[PDB]
Amino acid sequence: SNAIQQSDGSMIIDGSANLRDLNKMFNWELDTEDARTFNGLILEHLEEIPDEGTICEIDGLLITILEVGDNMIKQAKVVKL
């Protein structure tokens, strides 16, 4: 999985990103109990496959959905809360 730091400090993360990997690398505190990937975490929280452009808060992160495909989150922008 790829993750790109933006000039403004935000991160663009792939939906496929492994939650435990993200936590260890960025010192985030994503819940790893039930989901394995960033996509999984977002889907478990939403009661509908979210549109691109959706902004949500999960586990200390402010997340903007950038790309959705095959009913999975492909890319999201992330800022720390």
Side-chain angles (χ1 to χ4, degrees):
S1 306
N2 296 131
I4 296 173
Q5 185 187 35
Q6 306 301 302
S7 56
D8 75 351
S10 65
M11 297 289 326
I12 308 312
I13 309 296
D14 289 339
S16 63
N18 179 276
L19 294 174
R20 289 182 170 160
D21 288 350
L22 291 174
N23 282 350
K24 170 150 188 170
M25 291 171 54
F26 305 135
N27 187 29
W28 292 347
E29 299 183 285
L30 305 181
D31 188 347
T32 61
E33 182 184 313
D34 296 282
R36 189 183 318 280
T37 60
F38 198 50
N39 172 60
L41 182 69
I42 297 166
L43 292 176
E44 291 181 14
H45 284 69
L46 294 194
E47 52 178 1
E48 42 82 64
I49 170 64
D51 296 347
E52 295 173 358
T54 300
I55 295 168
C56 284
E57 289 98 41
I58 301 178
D59 295 348
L61 302 182
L62 177 64
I63 299 164
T64 303
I65 308 300
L66 301 181
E67 188 188 348
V68 177
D70 269 20
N71 293 140
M72 86 162 272
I73 289 83
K74 293 290 183 181
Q75 295 192 21
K77 167 185 166 182
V78 176
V79 177
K80 186 81 162 180
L81 285 176

